Design a binder for this molecule. Structure first.
Ligand code: HEM
Ligand code: HEM
Ligand SMILES: Cc1ccnc(CCCCCO[C@H]2CNC[C@H]2Cc2cc(C)cc(N)n2)c1
Ligand SMILES: Cc1ccnc(CCCCCO[C@H]2CNC[C@H]2Cc2cc(C)cc(N)n2)c1
Ligand SMILES: C[C@H](O)[C@H](O)[C@H]1CNc2nc(N)[nH]c(=O)c2N1
Ligand SMILES: C[C@H](O)[C@H](O)[C@H]1CNc2nc(N)[nH]c(=O)c2N1
Ligand SMILES: [Zn+2]
Lengths: 405, 404
């Protein structure tokens, strides 16, 4: 056959070959000796120009003018700018294209069928921590849209030679506090202990609830971060109830509507946007399985199993499985009742299969990380489990970056 | 570079140094990871060095590393390869090698049991009839009236001249799958091809959902022969549900003994083309994959209807809820029948202990995350949150071509 990886779907028997991976210019962590695919984080003028030329080429292909005069002129303009200043700057429409392409390129995202529909807010004029806050509030308002969620990204100024970065210190725009107790346990979300403590070091008066919304720590170049409280009316939340287990509401659980990642670096043509928060909507398992049932998160499985009167003293009762299903159902039901956009893991994986087919035809492949794409409950009940995937790094890309402190 | 390996639930970290012992490349490269692929597309001196490496493993295992016996065994192996192009294992080495092949299998969640393996040496087998006798004794031994005991039977090694000893069936117990002119399948769609090969070689088919297939057994360079397993040797479990009474009416069942019969066992460069092995099931293999895969028995919808679930929308989680009850029924039914089984929580907890044992013993453990994490409730098991490094060590179990 072809000398490109063969990719099989074992449910349907169908075969594709991934040719897109040939475009990867960046190595992942695997070698012929050992696969490191399951690791969460596996650990310059000529170089900038070559990433920039590549990206400008991607742009001109996307608008079907490769080899055109406007294409050759832009290339020259980019080399001249880099030549005389050591950097360059994107056109508005280049940034929109690059932001969408980073999403389309993200191997860990099951929601990529939506990739073409992203509102890009250009905030490259931002010059202060206070203005970042305004931009972020506008982002949250637009994206939340009273529950009819819309995908969006706001892009703050790029990294610059010798000047400090724009950074949002919080990992997400909405995060529940995690308060360390004298006995060593945690009230609230244990994922957020560090950010919670940093907010308190920077003058935040802490609450003491399990769902206290954190303030934002926003950092403009070469300044200490400044603390900003989100007006509560901007943060849509959904109290959790279950459709037939009437006691579930009494548990006082809730989650926020807007999933907005704020700690990732957006890379386009070698340019680095260190503050570029992006948002979409939730797949129900993120809330109902990971955030609520991880042992190191809210860890509510046993509490729910006891309310359901399950035998929690033995693994073979499948008490964990039964409780998790009911908690996932509660999440779906509560978001539906509240008219807030959410997608269940069956619908989301079906839509990703459609995405894979669309991308096979458009680009000859789709970079995908199987362990991240397969949902954390009911894996083999979803079509993606039976689908082989090829994982590789394309650019434009969203990348993890070190914490600013 | 030795990988750092993190558990994200506990925050603990190890470094895998065992991977440096790998002499066999997987499908990944720095440009793209192919870890999710089920089978990626992939002389005396080379046999001699695999042979020496293996003999060293063995003498080290019995602590007699560097002894008279060690050096004379290396000379024997060398003398034999130099003269004949091949060599032969002593039974004690075979037993060590088979256990090590299991220990090394990255897709196996059950490896806490790796030291406890009954090895039947069947290298004095010269006919399909003889293979059948050995397979029947394996089944009787391993089944043990429901108190399942792990075992492997090792038939004669591949030899340069001639055809292989092979068991054509992928497991020793398989249900027939009867294709219909109208395309559909009665029975197990995984076994349509093997069912058809059996008929073509003379089997009189049944017409039920759970007809146990005969074995097609092949001695070198001969047509395969058909053998019907005595019904008494094949322990089966009727499936019922502890509370839902209609569930038994579905007429469902599964066999006790998972015995894989199509993999090649490689020890010291020698290759055992027929070396069936068995343990016991993890319940999700039956309750989730075999019964709920859409390309297997595909019973989710039927169960969901029996439960009166709302089937018209994904967001009712009807699939999830039905899958759970089906898994519960498998566990309940094996327990009631006193047939060994392990649930996915207990199995993954045992595998975590195994990882720790292996860290102390060998400085790592090769494991394939996609296979170790169960197909329901992944993140509810400890293995979901555990980083894993995958690589090929020898001795090994490998896939091999179908013999037809
Ligand atoms: C429109 C609805 C969307 C859905 C349902 C969705 C779904 C998901 C899910 C379920 C994950 C896994 C997260 C986890 O396990 O913690 C994820 C990861 C991700 N998605 Fe999305 N996605 C959406 C939109 C977006 C958008 C708009 C972007 C960027 C513009 C994006 C970029 C990402 C990235 C970069 C990751 C990886 C995050 C990381 O590694 O930390 N996705 N997506
Ligand atoms: C003692 C109880 C055992 C349990 C509970 C167990 C569990 C499992 C499970 C759940 C799988 C994945 C199977 C699938 O998804 O279809 C598996 C695969 C495997 N196990 Fe075991 N195991 C056991 C014993 C053994 C033994 C005795 C051997 C060999 C001597 C072995 C070697 C393997 C191999 C080679 C695979 C991979 C099969 C393939 O790639 O086709 N295991 N094990
Ligand atoms: C836009 C959208 C749509 C739906 N869901 C989301 C939320 C994604 C949350 C991502 C959280 O990922 C974090 C927490 N768990 C694994 C870890 C992965 C990771 C690790 C690190 C060091 C950095 C990073 N950016 N991402 C976002
Ligand atoms: C000892 C033991 C304990 C518990 N379970 C088992 C049964 C294992 C059945 C494995 C069958 O695997 C088959 C069917 N699904 C993926 C596929 C992997 C595979 C594919 C191919 C071509 C060959 C092969 N050997 N293995 C055996
Ligand atoms: C160790 C393992 O890589 C890790 O727990 C991964 C597995 N798959 C995941 N998949 C998603 N979508 N999100 C995650 O946080 C994780 N965690
Ligand atoms: C494509 C994917 O690798 C394939 O469906 C794998 C996933 N994980 C698995 N895990 C186990 N234990 N058994 C399997 O057959 C599979 N199938
Ligand atoms: Zn890999």
């Amino acid at each position: 056959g072809p000398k490109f990886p063969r990719v099989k779907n074992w449910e349907l028997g169908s075969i594709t070959y991934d040719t897109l991976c040939a475009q990867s210019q960046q190595d992942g962590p695997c070698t012929p000796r050992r696969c490191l695919g399951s690791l969460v984080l596996p650990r310059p003028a000529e170089q900038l120009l070559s990433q920039a030329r590549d990206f400008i080429n991607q742009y001109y292909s996307s608008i079907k003018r490769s080899g055109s005069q406007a294409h050759e002129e832009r290339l020259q303009e980019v080399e001249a700018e880099v030549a005389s200043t050591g950097t360059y700057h994107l056109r508005e429409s280049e940034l929109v294209f690059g932001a969408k392409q980073a999403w389309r390129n993200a191997p860990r995202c099951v929601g990529r069928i939506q990739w073409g529909k992203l509102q890009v807010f250009d905030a490259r004029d931002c010059s202060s921590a206070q203005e970042m806050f305004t931009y972020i509030c506008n982002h949250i308002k637009y994206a939340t849209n009273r529950g009819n969620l819309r995908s969006a990204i706001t892009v703050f100024p790029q990294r610059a030679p010798g000047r400090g970065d724009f950074r949002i210190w919080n990992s997400q725009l909405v995060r529940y506090a995690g308060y360390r107790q004298q006995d060593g346990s945690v009230r609230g979300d244990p994922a957020n202990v560090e950010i919670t403590e940093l907010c308190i070091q920077h003058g935040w008066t802490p609450g003491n609830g399990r769902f206290d919304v954190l303030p934002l720590l926003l950092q403009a170049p070469d300044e200490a971060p400044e603390l900003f409280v989100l007006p509560p009316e901007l943060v849509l939340e959904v109290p959790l109830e279950h459709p037939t287990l009437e006691w579930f509401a009494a548990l006082g659980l809730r989650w926020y509507a807007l999933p907005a990642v704020s700690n990732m670096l957006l890379e386009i043509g070698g340019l680095e946007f260190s503050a570029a928060p992006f948002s979409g909507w939730y797949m129900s398992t993120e809330i109902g399985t990971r955030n609520l049932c991880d042992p190191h998160r809210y860890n509510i499985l046993e509490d729910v199993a006891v309310c359901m009167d399950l035998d929690t003293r033995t693994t073979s009762s499948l008490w964990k499985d039964k409780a998790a299903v009911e908690i996932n159902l509660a999440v779906l039901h509560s978001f539906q009742l509240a008219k807030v956009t959410i997608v269940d893991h069956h619908a989301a994986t079906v839509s990703f299969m459609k995405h894979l087919d669309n991308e096979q035809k458009a680009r000859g492949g789709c970079p995908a990380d199987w362990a991240w794409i397969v949902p954390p409950i009911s894996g083999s009940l979803t079509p993606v489990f039976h689908q082989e995937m090829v994982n590789y790094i394309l650019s434009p890309a969203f990348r993890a970056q070190p914490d600013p402190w």
